[PDB]
Amino acid sequence: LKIVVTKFGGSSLADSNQFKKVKGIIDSDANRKYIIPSAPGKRTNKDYKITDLLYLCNAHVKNGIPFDDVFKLISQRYTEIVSELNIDMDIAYYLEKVKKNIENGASSDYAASRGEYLNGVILAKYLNAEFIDAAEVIFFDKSGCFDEKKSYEKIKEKVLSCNKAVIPGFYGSSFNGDVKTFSRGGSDVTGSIISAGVNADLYENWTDVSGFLMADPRIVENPKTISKISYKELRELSYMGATVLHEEAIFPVKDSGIPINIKNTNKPSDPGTLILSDTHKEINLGTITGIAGKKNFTVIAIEKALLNSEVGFCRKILSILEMYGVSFEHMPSGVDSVSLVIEDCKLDGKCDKIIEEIKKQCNPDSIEIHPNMALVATVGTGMAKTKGIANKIFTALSKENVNIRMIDQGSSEINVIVGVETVDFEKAVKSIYNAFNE
Amino acid sequence: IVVTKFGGSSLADSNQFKKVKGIIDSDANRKYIIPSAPGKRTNKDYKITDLLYLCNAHVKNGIPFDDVFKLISQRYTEIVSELNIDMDIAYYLEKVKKNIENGASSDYAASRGEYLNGVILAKYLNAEFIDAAEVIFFDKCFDEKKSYEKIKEKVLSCNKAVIPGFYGSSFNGDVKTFSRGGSDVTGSIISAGVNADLYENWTDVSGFLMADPRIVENPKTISKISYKELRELSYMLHEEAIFPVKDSGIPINIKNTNKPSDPGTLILSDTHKEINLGTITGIAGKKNFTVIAIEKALLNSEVGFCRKILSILEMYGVSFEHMPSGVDSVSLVIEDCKLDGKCDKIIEEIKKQCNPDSIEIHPNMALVATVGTGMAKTKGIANKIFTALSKENVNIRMIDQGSSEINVIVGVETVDFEKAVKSIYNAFN
Ligand SMILES: N[C@@H](CCCC[NH3+])C(=O)O
Ligand SMILES: N[C@@H](CCCC[NH3+])C(=O)O
Ligand SMILES: N[C@@H](CC(=O)O)C(=O)O
């Protein structure tokens, strides 16, 4: 039958109760064959986080001290869990071995990866599934990059040959056989990898929210869930940037046609958003997929006599922005003028020196600054390229009496970006949603 | 005190000189005059300034240039002859042949076009000839302080005066030619010095029009235009000619030598020009560009991805009009002719230094810039424009606005250019 592969995040394994939710989800569908765990999430704001505490042990070892006070809390964390779940195992055998390894000079990467490992070994028992260490099945190369062709070969050999298997998350083996952890991707990528390697049908990604929403729920009331979403589509929304699964995490799935379903461990019935492939997603005829804005931006408007004739005028301008840790969002231009739209935190403090260097090299006539802009990105495949689709957005914004301060449509076929006064941000986003939902 | 510039077309020949006289003594206040060298009479005709550079070229190869100079001297002696002016123009011409053949600079040569026309003007119009070299000065760049001193002394002390206008004296007293606004800058320079009330720029067109008459039948005339609009409407005309008058009150007034009754248009300061909320000032376009679509995984997290791309564009003779960018893509809008021949070399270079998942070339795009201060903070201006374009089935390939409050730029398929331009005008008229 179908081969679904599941990952559960920190919030899904914060304590014993969540684990019961995970067991529930797993034996509620026999096709949930493969399970990838994160390390226990914080259960309250001021709670300590395991992985961090692990690193800290390694710090004691670098510093030539015991870390017995620290490792108490770890074992304490993990013994309460396997106790409350009343599981037939001796977790100390695992903890005790980890402690030793660390104080006998284990790498940081080894140290911090044990949060996922321990959850792995617990879950294999608790869910009656074969435990398969990551270090056996995921491999890196000489530079430090993910060796694809090998890992999958191994996955097919070791993982798809099991009926039900747990596979810990956040790490694999380095070229030299020693434990290497991912730098970007967390337990999500390892989930994607496994799916790729097993040729899974679905990769369920279990979190604490029932998919993604069409808009910010603080702003719009009771906003629809995004039934379906392409990768390119999602990427556009990710940047602007709604709290959504990052590109880093899903590159292995992307090559093959493996759909991801974002799902909620605390409301499993709730259907997900279903992140499809570009050529695997259909195209709803003239419609919005999502609306995602970010506040706090400032434009640097640069009027210059025949700016259009001379070459390298702009090249000089962002050679200067490269000279600091400051990226630009957009470079809207006119006939003999050009702007730079730049986020405020990215500009914080540095602003002043930058205006001077451009004045030296480029030699404009006017150089003003106008802050208090926000950006609203409205995204969808079906607006690519529908008639009057930007006009529909401007009609909306006209009805709410809100002055437009930037338009970009042209950067991307599935995306119109509108820039407006920061006061009007929430008003705009509202207006555009209503425009497309009855 | 009304200063006046006359362009080469307005001095192309004796008949045009007559027209100029008719204008000048139909207003006592037209007290000061700047001519250009004579424009071309027909399209095949030679152009005196260029002939002057050509003599300079013969001297650089140490060959005579009599054939060329015969053509210039003939050109000028005919004007005075036809005008029946009692002067000895050969006095002036012969001196010019000598200086040129005595290794004089190209700037000196080119200047003679308007110098010579100037001494002629003095007579026809009966005004005191004031060489620009003795009044407009440069440093070691324009010497604002020193020149204005000499203008009040030498010019302002005259009832009528003629100052030729494509040049002045350099630091070391040599002749120097404006690299920038021709005779239009002289007219402004004088206008400031001689603290004028109006500056008439006399062209062969009765001001500017809201849109191209080729495209919209009988377009309204642009009575008043701010400096900032004018620039932003450059697709239709100067900026480097206009600096000095900016800080002045002095309004420029573009006017028609062949139709002096026409009020023309009036280039105003931004603070002087009034703002009509919900109005356009003009619509202007240009129609052979190509967009280069470039796509990449995490384009924006790269180290100066765009910098690198237009660095590559910097190392060729390619100026671009717009750079749309976002998330995981970037576009370059480059004028077809500016791209001519260099295209495939450019594709590789960026394909080399960058990681492009994809590169496509979409040509056939024409830009339309609709402009006016009255679309400043006003709601619905975009919306008014684009409803117009929807109505008429014009597919929009790019919208760019954000560089200026008083300008939206649409990109349409070149076939829809006229249709679009017409539509926008109709929307606001
Ligand atoms: N042509 C300029 C940019 C002009 C932007 C405004 N039209 C360049 O290549 O740097
Ligand atoms: N700031 C980026 C460009 C981002 C434009 C949006 N994709 C760079 O340095 O090239
Ligand atoms: N044609 C002159 C300008 C002018 O006199 O209008 C030049 O050489 O720039």
CB of B353 less than 8 A from some CB of A: no
| Omega before residue A241 within 30° of 0, cis | yes
Q: What is the resolution of this structure in A?
A: 3.0
CB B100 within 8 A of CB B65: yes
Chain A CB contacts of B306 below 8 Å: 318, 331
- Residue-by-residue DSSP string for B129-173: E--GGGT-BB---B-HHHHHHHHHHHTTT-SSEE---SEEE-TTS
Chain B touched by A157 (CB under 8 Å): no
- How many angstroms separate the alpha carbon of residue A121 from the centre of ligand 3? 86
Contact of B223 with B171, CB cutoff 8 Å? no
Mutate to test the interface with B, among A236, A404, A417 (most CBs of B within 10 A): A404
Residue B290 pairs in a beta bridge with B334
DSSP string for A160-191? TTSSSEE---SEEE-TTSSEEE-SS-HHHHHH
Instruction: Please classify residue B213 by burial: count the beta carbons closer than 10 Å to its beta carbon, then call 0-12 exposed, 13-18 middle and 19+ buried.
Output: exposed
Does residue B335 belong to the interface with chain A, where contact is any CB pair within 8 Å?
A: no
Known binding residue A208? Answer is yes
Q: What's at A263, amino acid-wise?
A: K
Q: Which residues of B326-347 are buried (b: 16+ CB within 10 A; e: fewer)?
A: bbbbbbbbbbbebbeeebeebe
Strands of the sheet with A260-264, listed across from one edge: A130-131, A165-166, A32-37, A4-8, A202-207, A260-264, A273-276, A228-230
Q: Which tokens hold the place of A67?
A: 């870390």
Domain spanning B1-270, CATH architecture: 3-Layer(aba) Sandwich (3.40)
Task: Tell me: is residue A7 an annotated ligand-binding position.
Answer: yes
- The residue whose two tokens read 């006592």 is B28
Q: Which residues of A touch B291 (CB under 8 A)?
A: 410
Scan residues 307-326 of A and list those with Cβ closer than 8 Å to B: 308-312, 314-316, 318-319, 321-322
Q: Smallest Cα–Cα separation from A420: which of A411, A434, A430?
A: A430
Write out A197-226 in H/E/C secondary structure.
Answer: HHCCCEEEEEECCCCCECCCCCCCCCCCEC
Cα(B299)–Cα(A329) distance, rounded to whole angstroms? 12
Say yes or no for a CB contact (<8 Å) between A239 and B307: no
Contact A303, B293 (CB under 8 A): no
Locate breaks in chain A with C to N over 2.5 A; list the residue preceding each: none
Q: Which atom of ligand 3 is nearest to the CA of B165?
A: 5
Q: Which residues contact A145 (CB under 8 A, 6 or more apart)?
A: none
In chain B, DSSP finds a helix count (H) and a strand count (E) of 14, 17
Residues B133, B105: Cα–Cα separation, whole Å: 15
Is A9 annotated as ligand-binding? Answer: yes
Ligand 3 pocket mutation pick from B167, B183, B240 by most atoms within 8 angstroms of CB: B183
Q: Which of residues 205-234 of B touch A (CB under 8 A)?
A: 228, 231-234
Q: Which residues contact A324 (CB under 8 A, 6 or more apart)?
A: A350, A353, A354
Beta strand pairing call for A130-131 and A165-166: parallel
- Residue A30: how many other CB atoms lie within 10 Å: 12
Q: What whole-number distance in Å separates Cα of residue B212 and Cα of residue B82?
A: 37
The domain ranges of chain B are 1-270, 271-429
Alpha helices in B269-324 (DSSP H): 305-314
A164 is in an annotated binding site: no
Q: Could A409 and B403 be called an inter-chain contact, meaning their C-beta atoms sit closer than 8 Å?
A: no
Chain A residues inside the 8 Å CB shell of B322: 332-333, 410
Q: ∠ at Cα A336 (A330, A341), nearest 5°?
A: 15
Rounded Cα–Cα distance for residues A94 and A84 (Å): 18
Which of the listed CATH numbers 3.20.20.140, 3.30.70.580, 2.60.120.10, 3.30.2130.10 matches domain A279-438? 3.30.2130.10
Which of A255, A318, A319 should one mutate to test binding to chain B, selecting the residue with the greatest count of B CBs within 10 A? A318
* Closest C-alpha among B255, B254, B335 to residue B292: B335
Cα distance between residue A287 and residue B264, in whole Å: 49
Rounded-to-integer distance, Cα A291 and Cα A38, Å: 30
How many other C-beta atoms are found inside a 10 Å radius of the C-beta of residue B148?
A: 20
Quick one: CA torsion of A173, A179, A184, A189, rounded to 10 degrees? 50
A1-278 sits in which CATH class?
alpha beta
- Whether residue A334 and residue B369 make contact (CB cut-off 8 A), yes or no, is yes
Ligand 3 pocket at CB < 6 A: B 7-8, 36-37, 49, 110, 114, 166, 182-183
Closest approach of B350 to chain A, Cα-based (Å): 14
Q: Which two tokens stand for residue B70?
A: 């015969």
**How many CB atoms neighbour CB B145 within 10 A?**
9
Q: How far apart are CA B61 and CA B49, in angstroms?
A: 19
Q: How far is CA A414 from the centre of its chain?
A: 20
Architecture of domain B271-429: 2-Layer Sandwich (3.30)
List CB contacts of A13: < 8 A, sequence separation 6 or more: A19, A22, A37, A38, A39, A40, A41, A119
